[PDB]
């Protein structure tokens, strides 16, 4: 596993989350789902814990963009970028972008909104791309199909563990 430079972390525990819009792709509970499955991935391995925001700056703003939005990095079309997002820091910092020029699904019938956006929560909370072919952070997105049988890997779990350690048992 991988942090980025200067280990940025999250001086908190308690984070919130806004979902900022969202996709013509999906229903909203779709949408609201995947988000908070996202999250609690994250949750059963650490002492942090999520709420949501409706309005105000939240630490960790979602949404969907197409080509240019509002920064220095817009997308490219269908395919290959489906996502980014900033590491754990003030204003820009922690939020995720999303691709709606690409097909987002509850199912591994286009691009699953679960797998992908678990993956960007991990940027947002500190963890850079982890070598391990078979870790949630590698940056190689494959059309698994296989939810079914989803494990954050024991890397993952080292990865976020080692920036705010095990959840309180
Ligand atoms: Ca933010
Ligand atoms: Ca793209
Ligand atoms: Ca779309
Ligand atoms: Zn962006
Ligand atoms: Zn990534």
């Not at 229903?27 to 988000?35: E, G, H, I, L, N």
């Amino acid at each position: 596993f991988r942090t980025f430079p200067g280990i940025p972390k999250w001086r908190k525990t308690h984070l919130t989350y806004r979902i900022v819009n969202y996709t013509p792709d999906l229903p909203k509970d779709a949408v609201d789902s995947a988000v908070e499955k996202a999250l609690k991935v994250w949750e059963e391995v650490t002492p942090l814990t999520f709420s949501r925001l409706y309005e105000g700056e939240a630490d960790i703003m979602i949404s969907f963009a197409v080509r240019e939005h509002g920064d220095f990095y817009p997308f490219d079309g269908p395919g290959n970028v489906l996502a980014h997002a900033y590491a754990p820091g003030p204003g820009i910092n922690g939020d995720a972008h999303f691709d709606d020029d690409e097909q987002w699904t509850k199912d591994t019938t286009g691009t699953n909104l679960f797998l992908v956006a678990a993956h960007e929560i991990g940027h947002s909370l500190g963890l850079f791309h982890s070598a391990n072919t078979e870790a949630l952070m590698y940056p190689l997105y494959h059309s698994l199909t296989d939810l079914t049988r989803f494990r954050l890997s024991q890397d993952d779990i080292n990865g976020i563990q080692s920036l705010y350690g095990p959840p309180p048992d």
